[PDB]
Design a binder for these strands. Structure first.
Ligand SMILES: [Mg+2]
Ligand SMILES: [Mg+2]
Ligand SMILES: [Mg+2]
Ligand SMILES: [Mg+2]
Ligand SMILES: [Mg+2]
Ligand SMILES: [Mg+2]
Ligand SMILES: [Mg+2]
Ligand SMILES: [Mg+2]
Ligand SMILES: [Mg+2]
Ligand SMILES: [Mg+2]
Ligand SMILES: [Mg+2]
Ligand SMILES: [Mg+2]
Ligand SMILES: [Mg+2]
Ligand SMILES: [Mg+2]
Ligand SMILES: [Mg+2]
Ligand SMILES: [Mg+2]
Ligand SMILES: [Mg+2]
Ligand SMILES: [Mg+2]
Ligand SMILES: [Mg+2]
Ligand SMILES: [Mg+2]
Ligand SMILES: [Mg+2]
Ligand SMILES: [Mg+2]
Ligand SMILES: [Mg+2]
Ligand SMILES: [Mg+2]
Ligand SMILES: [Mg+2]
Ligand SMILES: [Mg+2]
Ligand SMILES: [Mg+2]
Ligand SMILES: [Mg+2]
Ligand SMILES: [Mg+2]
Ligand SMILES: [Mg+2]
Ligand SMILES: [Mg+2]
Ligand SMILES: [Mg+2]
Ligand SMILES: [Mg+2]
Ligand SMILES: [Mg+2]
Ligand SMILES: [Mg+2]
Ligand SMILES: [Mg+2]
Ligand SMILES: [Mg+2]
Ligand SMILES: [Mg+2]
Ligand SMILES: [Mg+2]
Ligand SMILES: [Mg+2]
Ligand SMILES: [Mg+2]
Ligand SMILES: [Mg+2]
Ligand SMILES: [Mg+2]
Ligand SMILES: [Mg+2]
Ligand SMILES: [Mg+2]
Ligand SMILES: [Mg+2]
Ligand SMILES: [Mg+2]
Ligand SMILES: [Mg+2]
Ligand SMILES: [Mg+2]
Ligand SMILES: [Mg+2]
Ligand SMILES: [Mg+2]
Lengths: 46, 267
RNA sequence: AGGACCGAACCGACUAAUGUUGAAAAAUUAGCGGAUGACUUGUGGCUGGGGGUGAAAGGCCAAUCAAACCGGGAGAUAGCU
RNA sequence: GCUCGCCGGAAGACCAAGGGUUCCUGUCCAACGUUAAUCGGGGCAGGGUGAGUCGACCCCUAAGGCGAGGCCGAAAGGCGUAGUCGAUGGGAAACAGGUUAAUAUUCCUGUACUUGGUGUUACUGCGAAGGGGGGACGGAGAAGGCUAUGUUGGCCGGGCGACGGUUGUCCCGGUUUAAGCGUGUAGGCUGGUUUUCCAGGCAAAUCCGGAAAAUCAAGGCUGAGGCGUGAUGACGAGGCACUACGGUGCUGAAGCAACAAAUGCCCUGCUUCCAGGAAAAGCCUCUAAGCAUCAGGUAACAUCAAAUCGUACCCCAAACCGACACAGGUGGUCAGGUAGAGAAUACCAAGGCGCUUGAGAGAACUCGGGUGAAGGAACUAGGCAAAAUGGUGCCGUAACUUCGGGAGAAGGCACGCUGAUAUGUAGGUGAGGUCCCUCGCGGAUGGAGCUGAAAUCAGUCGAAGAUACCAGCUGGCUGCAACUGUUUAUUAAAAACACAGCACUGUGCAAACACGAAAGUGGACGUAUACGGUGUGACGCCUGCCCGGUGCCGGAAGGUUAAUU
RNA sequence: AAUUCCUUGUCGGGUAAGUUCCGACCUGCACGAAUGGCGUAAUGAUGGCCAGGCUGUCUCCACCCGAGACUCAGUGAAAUUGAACUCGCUGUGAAGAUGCAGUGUACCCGCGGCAAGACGGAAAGACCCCGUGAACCUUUACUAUAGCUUGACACUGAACAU
RNA sequence: GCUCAACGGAUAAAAGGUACUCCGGGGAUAACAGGCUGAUACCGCCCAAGAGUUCAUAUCGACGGCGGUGUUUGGCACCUCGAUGUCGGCUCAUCACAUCCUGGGGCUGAAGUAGGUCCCAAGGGUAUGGCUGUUCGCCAUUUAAAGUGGUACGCGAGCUGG
């Protein structure tokens, strides 16, 4: 049937993608939780 | 039904009930003074006033008060206006300006219709209550001498004053009991709106009801968590309000503001 | 004309068989209901957890729901195994 | 390579979404392919996506988001004015052949078009973030005309036939051809024009709106297709040479008419209905400030500019969502022949495939089917499952009924083919000839050719002619719920939820009520014929007695009673 | 009767025979008038009963056509599993024995088939009980609290009258 | 100064629902089946007042008495709660004997025919339907007859799911 996911790369970033992150309060932290705290090469996209 | 003309009964052949047509409004559609008006059942956040979906809206249309004094209008034709069944009127002023009014009773063609002081008592235009005889024939008043709201529900609605009730405050809305009000305020004095309208029965849900309002009915439907009274085998008992507010009788609106009016019902 | 009638697309799931370490974490086969409507569908948007949404079944809220998932208080407490 | 079989409203073709080199060539076969593998969407190399007209950027705004200042709020932060973003919607312009191993309305050829600057020429009042118009919008239905396109004929090229006949009556194939340019047609819509006057359009306006007069009409917008041109060009069956075996260079006939269609186009139409159907910009126009021999405006042409990204391939699937080369899921477009009501269904075109273990055997038993003597529901919880009915036309049809229905009730009869009526009929289509005229894709009269159902007699074949696929089983009594609808995604579709109707109750608008610490928002740009909450659930006849208990509504004199002094 | 315990009530009907069904009766264990009462044409993938047709549902299965099952070649799983040299019977026994006792029987090993036992496989039983466990729900349980509502003080002033 | 009376007295202050359920445990503890027991049940025998016209014992037997079985209704709580799937049906069974039919006998209140009862006997045989989920039962109609019981009330890694 229709698995729970579907595609859409334009609907995603508008939920995650530093403009979606930095725009929100705790959101700017999400990048720090990774980049600063952790060491993620790169984590913020679709 | 009881007056002119004969109102169809819709010949059931598909499980369909009577409607209530008029004659026409010679132009199926409006003019140039109307907005789009968005349409929701959420309050820029959550639900609220739950139930209300239907479809197709637009068509704002307007004008009230009728500040435009001593300058006559001519009624080109009647017309439509959604959500508020009460016709509308159009009108043209001798200078080429076009408002919309609110079709009182008999009118149609030409018709004097003019606002102002001591303009012309009949069922034409607005007129400061400060100048109104028996007023047993008054229209949409103004809770405040300047606005122009009150009962824009001209659909057969009344507000019979009391003729020459001085004191500078009186009035008698429909079932809304009585309530004193200023006199500088004005009234259309048309005092009507074709009540025959609000008489044919919608029909059968969807076929006309669904278009606007949703399944407002929820009843107990059990589930002792969704509503204050629910669950059980096949019945319900106990009090039957909605969110410990009580549904039977009660009354609300305390120390509000004005609170200067009278009479009212009880039972 | 009609929440009108028979019936494909489309939408849905009443019955039986098969499958049950499946082709498949709900389907296949033969039938079955709606099919101009409270219809059906693409794209994008809005409601956030004691909160939402609900033609109401505690149903749905990412194979999770009589209170989601992730991280934390946390080595909760466990007269029990 | 020849057969064979399968799909063909697709199992074909195109695109979006998503994917992100999977595309093409050469190579190699460890791992990956549920086997072998010389083969691949596998490995390693290379190569491969060329734009002023297609799309994104970009103007415009929807839902909604963000939001100077601002209003709120312990902090975080919420809301929101100007304003600024945001397509799934509106704004400008290209086609047909050709070509690559792979690109293609991007490259080549032939023929075009849009907009901006600059210039030359001519005529002229130009000018907003502003006013007006316009963009600009529903559902349903009923045509007519037309095109796509198919069929038949004519024309052109080709063959005379592994077996009886066909060497002119015949069989096969082709018969195509675009934007743009001229023509303003079947239709669609709407009276022009001039002058003056003004409490309107935030200021102004010749514009729009209103008012008077005056003179004519035969106008003015819109518009599918057709016809010329494009095009004595291209393409074109097919021949001739060369082949690497895929294919190449050259050459190249006819290329028309008649009928038949659409769900496409005229049609953002026409008719009609109630539930009364985005916005903003471009566009046209009117003026403001300002300009004031100027600049600008309109038109013609000359020229320059049209940047930058995307373009490969999969795309109902082996490239996307399902862990898989998974019998599942996935939006739009196109729409050939015979038969048919048809996008059903069957057989086929173009085209694409045989589904990545096979070879034998021919037990029980399991799955999917075919046929069954006599019986015919005896089976069983239950006719579960099967078997069964099944089409068009016509005859004919009960209780009951809200007069609509029940109803395809039920139950019957005719159906193939041939000849005739009639060499093709009724109907449909509409050619010169003729008649006339502002005038012409004119009109009228003529009815050639073309196409063509049904019926009625008569005859004939088989066991059977709605012969296959396809395609209601019918009726009688009774419960429940009026009825369409909704529900437990993944054991319940129901008598449950909803429903229209009814009733009670609350709400005078800063409404009741709800979201919210608040601001604010919904209710509603509504206002008691309105909005909310509760219960009942069409309709018909109705809906009795109890106010002791609890709750609610009114009173509030007297008793009891908080903080406070 | 979607309500009747007694219950297959009693009478009638349909049947060769009817704990169901339909029509009555009333003795309503324990119907009843908008937590609606009695009717109701039409509709229903709705519950119950009867009939015609139809038949492999059945008496009672037969044959046949295909996909497996079997054989060969290639690739190549699964749960489970203390260890095995893993027979029947009667008794025994923590109480239903391949394993103890007595006894009977039995040359060693595969292949295809069937499911009686290995209290067979699978999920620390969901029933039952318990823990001074959990959760969600209810109310005239207890204690609180948002909201609603009362009053005083205060932001809150000037005059007059009784 | 306390029916802290749940009287060594958890608080000053405390009711319920779960089939929407959940966890930690238990065969320390219920439900099915096994097991122990046999009161109860069923089967048999002892005494013999009575009935049987008469006559205790063809047939039956009061008041009372002793046992057999493991089969009903039960008692217990030993085996399973890190799972032993319930009733009925289908399929297919296997044993007992306290025998339903058939076979052989004794008595009879046995003329015959048919029976009554008791002894012996397990070779073989031992119904289709209507109603109901039924087992059973009642009813229709057959039959020589339509046996009683054990086998986890035989039989779901065999079917069904009323
Ligand atoms: Mg419920
Ligand atoms: Mg509650
Ligand atoms: Mg319909
Ligand atoms: Mg199906
Ligand atoms: Mg249909
Ligand atoms: Mg969406
Ligand atoms: Mg879920
Ligand atoms: Mg956690
Ligand atoms: Mg801690
Ligand atoms: Mg722990
Ligand atoms: Mg690669
Ligand atoms: Mg390839
Ligand atoms: Mg490769
Ligand atoms: Mg904001
Ligand atoms: Mg913008
Ligand atoms: Mg877009
Ligand atoms: Mg290509
Ligand atoms: Mg020959
Ligand atoms: Mg491409
Ligand atoms: Mg999967
Ligand atoms: Mg494959
Ligand atoms: Mg037969
Ligand atoms: Mg039967
Ligand atoms: Mg039977
Ligand atoms: Mg069936
Ligand atoms: Mg069939
Ligand atoms: Mg009944
Ligand atoms: Mg219904
Ligand atoms: Mg329905
Ligand atoms: Mg379900
Ligand atoms: Mg279901
Ligand atoms: Mg109800
Ligand atoms: Mg009453
Ligand atoms: Mg009855
Ligand atoms: Mg009742
Ligand atoms: Mg009811
Ligand atoms: Mg033993
Ligand atoms: Mg087996
Ligand atoms: Mg086990
Ligand atoms: Mg346990
Ligand atoms: Mg004690
Ligand atoms: Mg429930
Ligand atoms: Mg547990
Ligand atoms: Mg024990
Ligand atoms: Mg027991
Ligand atoms: Mg045991
Ligand atoms: Mg014996
Ligand atoms: Mg029987
Ligand atoms: Mg048993
Ligand atoms: Mg099984
Ligand atoms: Mg059942």
């Amino acid at each position: 049937m229709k698995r729970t996911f579907q595609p859409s790369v334009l609907k995603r970033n508008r939920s995650h993608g530093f403009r979606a992150r930095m725009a929100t309060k705790n959101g700017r932290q999400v990048l720090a939780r990774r980049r600063a705290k952790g060491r993620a090469r790169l984590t913020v996209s679709k | 039904v009881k007056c002119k003309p004969t109102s169809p009964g819709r010949r059931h052949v598909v499980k369909v009930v009577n409607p209530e047509l008029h004659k026409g409004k010679p132009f199926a559609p409006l003019l140039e003074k109307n907005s789009k008006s968005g349409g929701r059942n959420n309050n820029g956040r959550i639900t609220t006033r739950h139930i209300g979906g239907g479809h197709k809206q637009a068509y704002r249309i307007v004008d009230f008060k009728r500040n435009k004094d001593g300058i006559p209008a001519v009624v080109e034709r009647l017309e439509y206006d959604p959500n508020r069944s009460a016709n509308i009127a159009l009108v043209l002023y001798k200078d080429g300006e076009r408002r919309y009014i609110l079709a009182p009773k008999g009118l149609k063609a030409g018709d004097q219709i003019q606002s102002g002081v001591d303009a012309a008592i009949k069922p034409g235009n607005t007129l400061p209550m400060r100048n109104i005889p028996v007023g047993s024939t008054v229209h949409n008043v103004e809770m405040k001498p300047g606005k122009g709201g009150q009962l824009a529900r001209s659909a057969g609605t009344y507000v019979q004053i009391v003729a020459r009730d001085g004191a500078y405050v009186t009035l008698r809305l429909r079932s809304g009991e009585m309530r004193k009000v200023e006199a500088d305020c004005r009234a259309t004095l048309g005092e009507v709106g074709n009540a025959e309208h609000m008489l044919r029965v919608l029909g059968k849900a969807g076929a006309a009801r669904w278009r606007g309002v949703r399944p407002t009915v929820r009843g107990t439907a059990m589930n002792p968590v969704d509503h204050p009274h629910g669950g059980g085998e096949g019945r319900n008992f106990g009090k039957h309000p909605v969110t410990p507010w009580g549904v039977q009788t009660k009354g609300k609106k305390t120390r509000s503001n004005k609170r200067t009016d009278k009479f009212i019902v009880r039972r």
